[PDB]
């Protein structure tokens, strides 16, 4: 209703929306204008990552939490920046895509695990460093 509503709106726009489009639960033009703009840099991050290596894994809610937590907590132990927030989002989308693929009905667990982490561990950093507007400025970068 208050600060929770702000935090909920930010995470929904920046994280949940892209995962639901990476997952085919939601079409491309179901996205807010803010979302297809930042989709570009998330999409580009995904392709940059697929050059590097491929991901293959998860059978239980318990296994999603430990595997997801382990990676992301190691992703930000060192430092937090908008570039690795992209990787966080992207990584969250790739584990959700795995779930809807296997039709295990665990993608919901992925979204909620990523949401919880971004709220507790990332949102104070992102708010103080420009938040939603900055990630929008971060999306432009070099259009090569």
């Amino acid at each position: 209703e208050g600060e929770e509503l702000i935090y909920h709106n930010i995470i929904n726009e920046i994280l949940v929306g892209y995962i639901k489009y990476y997952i085919n639960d939601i079409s491309e033009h179901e996205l807010s204008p803010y979302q297809q703009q930042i989709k570009k840099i998330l999409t580009y991050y995904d392709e940059c990552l697929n050059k590097q290596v491929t991901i293959t894994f998860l059978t239980s809610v318990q296994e999603i939490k430990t595997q997801f937590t382990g990676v992301v907590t190691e992703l930000f132990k060192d430092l937090i920046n908008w570039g690795r927030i992209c990787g966080f989002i992207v990584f969250s989308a790739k584990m959700a895509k795995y779930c809807k693929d296997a039709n295990n009905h665990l993608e919901s667990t992925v979204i909620t695990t990523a949401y919880n982490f971004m709220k507790h561990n990332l949102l104070p950093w992102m708010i103080s460093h420009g938040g939603q507007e900055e990630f929008l400025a971060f999306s432009l970068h070099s259009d090569m």
């Binding site: 290596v53 992703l75 920046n81 690795r84 966080f88």
Partner: peptide, 19 residues
């Protein structure tokens, strides 16, 4: 593994955070 994926996610994120 998992520790190596992070450093991949890290340095990619680091490369995009440039300039």
């Amino acid at each position: 593994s998992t520790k190596k994926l992070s450093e991949c996610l890290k340095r990619i994120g680091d490369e995009l955070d440039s300039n």
